[PDB]
Ligand binder design. Structure first.
Ligand code: GDP
Ligand code: GDP
Lengths: 246, 246
């Protein structure tokens, strides 16, 4: 049919921007759709073909009673109702578009723990998942293993090739933006330093890693910058290369 | 010092209730504190010794500008400021209490992705983590592996023995509440049925499991019911048994 990319990434990871900034760069050579599944956001750098707000806004479920966490859960419980509609709504978008950029809710776990997100994922035609991570949590070894495991988690949960990605690599350094790569592209040295950590964690973080030594093909980490179109091109390849594979 | 229990569990898992309902049952024989780290909730079945709201309410960061996901992130960015205070505030609670029940934010990933939650965890004296899961997502094999991996994730991220737990086992069946146990206490049959799934996922969900065959001690799943005090007693043992071990 055509390529679909789901941007999953925790609150404040700046994925929405990326979601928009990637599309406009893709509107130069490709026809682009824009699905927003987030029920709680103010603006959008983009014009959604599909918007969950038109049905329901967290802001609403507020002026009704619930608080934040409770509103969120109700929105996606009210969505699992306009579901089979809302689904098809994304397929009829497939065959009139080259890329289709899906923008999952800020509460990653919303999309991740509640049928609305999982199911929608089963119904999509081999979607690629780009797991945006914010580089300001990569400080110590575990953190690297932590983020990469979770990414695999997502892959597992959502059943869809999931790509680890660092965001906002502009606000990076020089060697820093390569230190990160030492704990990434290279999957061996990460485990190497984990073996050094004599602490309980270090034990199972280390033991955890070897998720490669055992089994589960390496995977390539994407470095991206919404603002300065960093690694944007590569997303495309991967997109195609995955779209091909499957 | 004394026992501290952190309840982590995704939105709508009904942990806050459990957090309160467990304490009042513990107020019968133990002196109990009550820390609420959630900046976005309406009421609380309990009287917090500590409340993050007194500093800042999501509701506020709303009537200022931000929306849901943006408010949340700002609250915990404003907390990493009253941090070293707010910390100590929990230690001076240690040595005047038997149990101390910590109530993490609904957006699990808030507590999980942003320093406020991680750091606070390092500063606590061997806290036990009870990962509440809602049984209405356990439908197919993966789901079981999914929830148990994530639990281990949490353990890893937060560095603290993490206990998988199903919630609301009252709204359960008979054999259902034992089917669940087949995919749990028994860690072998879960992998057994995963090997049956000839799908891509089944491959790495199966491959994933063997997180025991390889290495990482079994762990016991808790069945809990806020309302009907189910498995409440066991929490205690574990609490003590862990408090002892370390
Ligand atoms: N410097 C920089 N800032 C970014 C980048 N991506 C997003 N941002 C900032 O973060 C905001 C986007 O947040 P948003 O995408 O809505 O958060 P999320 O969708 O919940 O993950 C933008 O207004 C930008 O100012 C980036 O690559 N570099
Ligand atoms: N039947 C049943 N309902 C529960 C249980 N625990 C919580 N609830 C319901 O869920 C609500 C609690 O939600 P809450 O704890 O605030 O959600 P969370 O803290 O974000 O995970 C309560 O008002 C109960 O009605 C349980 O064990 N059994």
């Amino acid at each position: 049919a055509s390529m679909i990319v789901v941007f999953v990434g925790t609150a404040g990871s700046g994925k929405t921007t990326l979601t928009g900034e990637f599309g406009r760069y893709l509107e130069d050579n490709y026809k682009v759709a824009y699905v927003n599944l987030d029920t709680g956001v103010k603006e959008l750098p983009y014009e959604p073909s599909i918007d969950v707000r038109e049905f329901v806004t967290v802001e609403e479920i507020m002026r009704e009673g619930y608080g934040p966490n409770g509103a969120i859960v109700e929105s996606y419980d009210r969505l699992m109702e306009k579901f089979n509609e809302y689904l098809n709504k994304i397929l009829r978008l497939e065959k009139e578009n080259d890329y289709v950029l899906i923008d999952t809710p800020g509460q990653m776990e919303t999309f991740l723990f509640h049928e609305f997100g999982v199911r929608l994922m089963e119904n999509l035609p081999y979607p690629l998942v780009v797991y945006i991570s914010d580089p300001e949590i990569l400080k110590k070894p575990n953190d690297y293993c932590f983020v990469r495991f979770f990414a695999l988690l997502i892959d597992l949960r959502l059943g869809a090739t999931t790509i680890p990605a660092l965001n906002k690599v502009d606000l990076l350094s020089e060697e820093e933006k390569e230190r990160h790569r030492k704990y990434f592209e290279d999957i061996d040295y990460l485990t190497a330093r984990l073996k050094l950590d004599p602490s309980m964690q270090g034990l199972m973080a280390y033991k955890m890693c070897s998720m490669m030594t055992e089994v589960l093909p390496p995977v390539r980490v994407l470095y991206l910058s919404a603002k300065t179109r960093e690694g944007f091109e590569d997303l495309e390849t991967l997109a195609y290369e995955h779209y091909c594979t499957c």
